[PDB]
């Protein structure tokens, strides 16, 4: 069975950028529901002992009757698992991945502007991602709980733009949420993920 992972920090650790109350609902209700629903689908099938990364990467090979749930709930589990790990109260904008972002976009500020633009124009529920695509960095969005790993691109950083991720503190002001996020990116983790994928 898949398990709801504990946060690596306290529910208040990301204040005043991401509110405690949201972290509680987001982790303990939303993420938990994805885990329970994924387990409901894979319990007593061949997928039970398959890794989450493998099934998301190989979504096409999941049998048709299970595929929507693995996509949606397995995506939910995978995406939120990654999300919590790339947030940190000790954000420092340095590391190999930061150097290579600057090489490609010219500056970190130009990177953030493209990221923000894509995050703010995403229509409906979804995610904005920094991915590695055949050695190169790219910013892409996905709808709902779709993940770029399914398309062969390795995600190293993501922003959840489902309204549950920001509505309590920010209501419709998604751009203010985006602004807040930069203060709490775990660039050490993103770098670790980048060094492995490049």
Using the structure block, give the residue that is written with the tokens 């329970």: 36
Stretch that binds its own copies, among 50-58, 91-99, 143-151, 188-196 (CB under 8 A): 143-151
Per CB under 8 A, 78 contacts its own copies? no
Whether the Cβ atoms of residue 168 and residue 129 lie closer than 8 Å to each other: no
CA 27 – CA 135 distance, rounded (Å): 32
The annotation status of 80 as a binding-site residue, yes or no, is: yes
164 annotated to bind ligand: yes
Tokens of residue 58, six digits: 């190989």
Beta bridge pairs of residue 155: 131
Chain breaks in the chain (C to N over 2.5 A) after: none
| Near its own copies in 41-70, by CB under 8 A | none
**Is residue 105 at the binding interface for its own copies, with CB under 8 A as the rule?**
no
Q: Which does 167 bind (CB under 5 to 8 A by kind): its own copies, Mn ion, none?
A: its own copies
Within the chain, strands assigned E span 126-133, 136-143, 154-160
Tell me which stretch binds its own copies (CB under 8 A): 55-63, 79-87, 89-97, 121-129.
121-129
Q: Cα-flanking dihedrals φ and ψ of residue 19, to 5°? A: -75, 150
Which of 115/162 has CB closer to Mn ion? 162
Report the interface residues with Mn ion, using CB under 5 A: 160, 162, 165
Taking the complex as a whole, how short is the minimal distance between the CB of residue 19 and its own copies, in angstroms? 12
Tokens 């995610």 identify what position? 127
**Cβ neighbour number for residue 177 with a 10 Å cutoff:** 22
- How far, in Å, are 69, 84, 178 from residue 120 at the CA level? 27, 21, 8
- Tell me which of its own copies, Mn ion, none is bound by residue 160, counting a contact when its beta carbon lies within the kind-specific cut-off of 5 to 8 angstroms: Mn ion
Q: Which does 94 bind (CB under 5 to 8 A by kind): Mn ion, its own copies, none?
A: none
Minimal distance, residue 82 CB to its own copies, in Å: 18
Compute the least distance from the CB of residue 36 to its own copies, in Å: 12
Burial class (CB in 10 A: 0-12, 13-18, 19+), 72: middle
Sites of contact with its own copies (CB under 8 A): 25, 29-30, 33, 72, 123-126, 143-145, 162-164, 167-168, 171-172
Q: Which residues are annotated as a binding site for Mn(2+)?
A: 26, 80, 160, 164
């Amino acid at each position: 069975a898949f398990k709801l992972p504990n946060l690596p920090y306290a529910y208040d650790a990301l204040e005043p950028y991401f509110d405690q109350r949201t972290m509680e609902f987001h982790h303990d209700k939303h993420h938990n529901t994805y885990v329970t629903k994924l387990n409901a689908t894979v319990e007593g099938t061949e997928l039970e002992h398959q890794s989450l990364a493998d099934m998301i990467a190989n979504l096409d090979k999941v049998p048709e009757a299970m595929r929507m749930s693995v996509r949606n709930n397995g995506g939910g589990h995978f995406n939120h698992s990654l999300f919590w790990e790339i947030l940190s109260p000790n954000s420092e904008e340095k590391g190999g991945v930061i150097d290579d972002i600057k090489a490609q976009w010219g500056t970190l500020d130009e990177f953030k502007n493209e990221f923000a633009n894509k995050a703010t124009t995403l229509f409906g529920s979804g995610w904005t991602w920094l991915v590695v695509n055949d050695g190169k960095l790219e910013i892409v969005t996905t709808p709902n709980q779709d993940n770029p790993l399914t398309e062969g691109k390795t995600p190293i950083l993501g922003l959840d733009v489902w309204e549950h991720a920001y509505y309590l503190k920010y209501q419709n002001k998604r751009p203010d949420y985006m602004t807040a996020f930069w203060n709490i990116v775990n660039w050490k983790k993103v770098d670790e993920l980048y060094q492995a994928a490049k």
